[PDB]
């Protein structure tokens, strides 16, 4: 409603770096808000794509941002009569970024890994990896929970059980308020998908450079399965956290599996022990139900509500014809211990191939009326197909069915405006929460400031 679409702020990165593929607000030890931006195709030292991370200070004029530097050299360790190898070429550093306290977590889901023992090998596979930084102090740490030293022959004998070689950890990421990093790995367990959790403090204390294989004892990984419903389900494509079991001491996990049960798609809500509390099934096959998940209380009852995006949903139209437009599902948490029922509200896109629901960002309370609001991106929507971000306001009964404000892309065609979103943080300290929108196709980020209601 009250986002300013006239005076925007533009941050930009190198050409072809996919600057803006992932972003988040970052507060330093003094509460000064900045913007961390991931650019997963930034060039490295050997003139090869390795990804990169930028930390943009808040300026109304925007512009260029300094780099948040990480180690981009491939590592080799000859230990235990084995050879450990990391490969950072085309790893995609910055394909996901997230901030918690004064720490930034930027991940490279396609960092490869292999272990050589004589003529055998573990196989060169993308286990993924995440880099952790404390910018004010310069501290650095890494976390790669799917690195192993088991040789290829063993996986074949045991029928590829507990095969974390293709995790792509850091594909999606989130941090609990308590400080526990939760990584989504959609390729874990031979593309079933797994989650990796570990306290941020223990990641730093247990990391030393060059070890490559080290134990993080407080970590917790989800479990393999022999149920074909989970096969090729990409469990962990998207991740989020919230409070769903009525116990404020436990933190619950929300996991998106957009190809679950033969491309039906699913979203599951679990406790911190990965025990399943609820499961939301997709409405239509190949709609990628679970591509994006978001958790916020939209109806002002204090109970977190769940939003799920299916950007490839084909809407039914006249003459028995379907039209891919995308769809968003709203689930209101019931009072006390009860299962989430049918969706309270269905928001369906309008533009063909618009992918309405590719990203869903909680905005906090935008218009300051007591109800939290959201933003839904259609990165190829709008009458021109350049992209659109639509704001839906909270109400006592859920959300408004019609948008209060639509943000047309200020970028050219193909910018994927809205592919990444983040809100609910006041960056200019004016009392209203603001919105940052990524357009990696144009290597730029747009900042929309919220203003008093007109």
């Amino acid at each position, epitope marked *: 409603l009250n986002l300013d679409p006239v005076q925007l702020t533009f941050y930009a990165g190198p050409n072809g770096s996919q600057f803006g593929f992932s972003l988040d607000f970052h507060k330093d030890s003094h509460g000064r808000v900045a913007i961390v931006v991931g650019a997963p195709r930034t060039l490295g030292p050997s003139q090869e794509e390795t990804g990169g991370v930028f930390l943009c200070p808040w300026r109304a004029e925007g512009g260029q941002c300094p780099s948040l530097l990480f180690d981009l050299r491939d590592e080799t360790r000859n*230990v*235990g009569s084995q050879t450990l190898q990391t490969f950072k070429a085309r790893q995609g550093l910055g394909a996901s970024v997230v901030s918690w306290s004064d720490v930034i977590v930027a991940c490279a889901p396609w960092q490869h890994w292999n272990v050589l023992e004589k003529t055998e090998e573990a196989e060169k596979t993308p286990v993924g990896s995440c880099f952790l930084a404390q910018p004010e102090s310069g501290r650095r740490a890494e976390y790669s929970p799917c690195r192993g030293n088991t040789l290829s022959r063993i996986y074949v004998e045991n029928d590829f059980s507990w095969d974390k070689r293709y995790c792509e950890a850091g594909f999606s990421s989130v941090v609990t308020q308590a400080g526990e990093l939760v990584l989504g790995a959609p390729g874990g367990y031979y593309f079933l998908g797994l989650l990796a959790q570990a306290p941020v403090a223990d990641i730093f204390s247990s990391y030393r450079p060059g070890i490559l*294989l080290w134990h993080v*004892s407080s970590q917790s990984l989800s479990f393999d399965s022999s149920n074909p419903e989970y096969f090729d389900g990409y469990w962990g494509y998207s991740v989020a956290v919230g409070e769903f079991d009525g116990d404020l001491n436990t933190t619950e996990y929300v996991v998106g599996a957009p190809t679950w049960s033969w491309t039906l798609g699913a979203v599951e809500i679990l406790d911190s022990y990965y025990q399943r509390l609820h499961r939301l099934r997709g409405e239509q096959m190949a709609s990628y139900f679970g591509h994006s998940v978001a958790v916020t209380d939209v109806n002002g009852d204090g109970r977190h509500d769940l939003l799920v995006g299916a950007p490839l949903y084909m809407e039914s139209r006249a003459d028995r014809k379907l039209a891919e437009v995308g769809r968003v599902y709203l689930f209101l948490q019931p009072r006390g211990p009860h299962a989430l029922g049918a969706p309270s509200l269905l928001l369906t896109g309008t533009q063909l191939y618009g992918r309405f629901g590719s990203a869903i960002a909680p905005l906090g309370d935008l218009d300051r009326d007591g109800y939290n609001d959201i933003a839904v991106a259609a990165p190829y929507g709008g009458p021109s197909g350049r992209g659109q971000v639509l704001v839906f306001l909270g109400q006592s009964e859920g959300l408004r069915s019609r948008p209060s404000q639509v943000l047309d892309s200020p970028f050219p065609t193909g910018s994927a405006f809205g592919f990444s979103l983040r809100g609910a943080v006041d960056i200019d300290d004016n009392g209203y929460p603001d919105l940052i929108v990524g357009a990696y196709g144009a290597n730029q980020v747009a900042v929309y400031r919220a203003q008093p209601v007109v």
Partner: antibody
Amino acid sequence: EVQLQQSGAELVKPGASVKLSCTASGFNIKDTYVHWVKQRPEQGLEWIGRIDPANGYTKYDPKFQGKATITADTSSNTAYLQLSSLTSEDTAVYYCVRPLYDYYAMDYWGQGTSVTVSS
Amino acid sequence: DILMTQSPSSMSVSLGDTVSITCHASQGISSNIGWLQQKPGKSFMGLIYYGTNLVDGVPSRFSGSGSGADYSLTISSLDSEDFADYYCVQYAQLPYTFGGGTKLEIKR
């Protein structure tokens, strides 16, 4: 806290067999590698072998191939070292070891199980 | 197997001394070495792993260094508890092999 509580001292005859135990306290034995090390005053320290209790796979110094047999039961959270055809040269103190962070390190040690072979 | 030659076998030193134990390998091990302590009539405690990294709980006066096949353990300002046995161990290759040992003794 990480503590490795081994069995008590053994007193056996030559030609017999013995099975030492290493129980994990304050953690799951399945987390890391578990090693076995032999100590004698003259010969010093010698590395017997290791086991990954998650799967049971083992490695051995070829010097101990035959006498040493390392096993593990995740149920009782314990790792074992079996020695067979005992000799006067098998009279030693035996420790179980596990690493702290580095997968391949030798950081945490049990108190040691004394073994004496004599007729 | 990799031979580990630890020197010296013993040294007579006093409190507050800054001393150094060395450990030479038969081939390069690239900091894949640990350092151990065995107080008289007791078990082992880890001091260093991967050449330089302190084990959690070990005082900062201990410090490891070296590269290739020549490494060193250094104790700045000896404490009354530091008089004990010390061993090195390489884990660059299987089987793991240890050093001969070094005993710190009180000088008088």
